[model samples]
Target: MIPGGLSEAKPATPEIQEIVDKVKPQLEEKTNETYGKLEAVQYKTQVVAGTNYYIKVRAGDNKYLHLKVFKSLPGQNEDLVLTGYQVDKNKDDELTGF
Candidate 1:
């Protein structure tokens, strides 16, 4: 582990790498997908628990594709942010005044 947290894979697999490359062209607005957990397959914790990754499906899409591995904990929303973003300007500047 590093100073603050567990270490993630420095480089992902080739197949996964290819998917990451093409994801930028596949996303669309106002779309949804489905998934299901397999019971018979073996499971492994390669990535650290609670480590989040944003799947960018389209170059123009605002939000990333929602796909996560490992166990997720509550209170994660507090740390969620846009990729390459330093701060939440929308919330910090009170865009909607919610």
Candidate 2:
């Protein structure tokens, strides 16, 4: 457990960190509010019918954001696109990076 009594918590992996870094600035600009400090992140991937779906759970101060990145078809040159996002406001939440 971490100092905050959070068990099953792990540091965000490099890949997840990269996604958060890329997404944060865009979201911040759109929302016109700082996401504050990122405390943890978790992600899962699913594949079906040649499409890739990725989900990231990011914990920041005063907010938890869910980010979804996807590739609709193979052999595309573009990066995985952000398709879905949501924010949940929860106070003093200790996140588990799945």
Candidate 3:
């Protein structure tokens, strides 16, 4: 694997679901559209000062979306940020540094 690049696809984790849960409000706030329950299928992580995550989620609206989220390092006020997102994603889509 290349340093600073993403890891290969991995199945969703329970923690991944919670990560989306914690960031859901931020998502609705920016999207301005309400959402219901979601499904996280897969993800890839990038090692940074903190950790960056790319999640493939099936939104409440029944659409596929990819989110780029960042989490702060320990002792740095542990935080989560939704840095970017993409629409019209497919399950077969490849996850790469964008």
Candidate 4:
């Protein structure tokens, strides 16, 4: 863990790794990336291990990114809803490049 912080960056618990592995591939296939694009995907996940988890993808990593656990509002049909998108707009009209 980082000093004065909670992150370890070494290894994750087995359970957490399990969850990460399960959905990583799908994320990659779905997000055929373009530079300078900002994509967001929201997963409707369970309150596993006492926190809500989100799986996100970043341009730099070219792989799956994990979200910190947080409190969630309970709702019906609980499911993972990933909304993937990117910032393809420019200040004027032309699309920006990375």
Identify the runs in model 4 with alpha carbons over 4 angstroms from their true place. 1-10, 26-64, 71-98
Over 4 Å off, model 1: 1-8, 26-67, 70-98
Give me candidate 2's TM-score against the actual structure.
0.48
RMSD for each model, in Å, please? 14.3, 7.8, 7.9, 10.8
Which predicted model would earn the best TM-score? 2
Among residues 3 or more apart in sequence or in different chains, the pairs in candidate 1 whose N, CA or C atoms overlap within 3 Å are: none
TM-score per candidate:
0.22, 0.48, 0.44, 0.28
Candidate 1: clashing residue pairs, number: 0
What candidate 3 gets wrong by more than 4 Å, as runs, is 1-6, 18-38, 59-62, 73-79, 86-98
The worst-scoring run of ten residues by lDDT in candidate 1 lies at 35-44
Q: Write the per-residue lDDT of candidate 1 for residues 1-98, one digit (tens) a residue.
A: 11111133222234433443444223322222232110001111242335444221211212232222334434453443323211111221111100
Residue 63 deviation, candidate 4, in Å? 4.6
Q: Tell me how far the alpha carbon of residue 94 in candidate 3 is from the true structure, in angstroms, after superposition.
A: 7.3
Order candidates by lDDT, high to low.
3, 2, 4, 1
Compared with the true structure, all predictions reach lDDT values of 0.25, 0.48, 0.50, 0.34
Residue 32, candidate 1: alpha-carbon lDDT: 22
User: Mind giving the per-residue lDDT tens digits that candidate 2 earns over 42-87?
Assistant: 5555554344444444555555556555665555545556665655
Better of 2 and 4 by lDDT: 2
Better of 1 and 3 by TM-score: 3
Q: Which of the two candidates, 1 or 3, achieves a greater lDDT against the reference?
A: 3
Ranking by TM-score: 2, 3, 4, 1
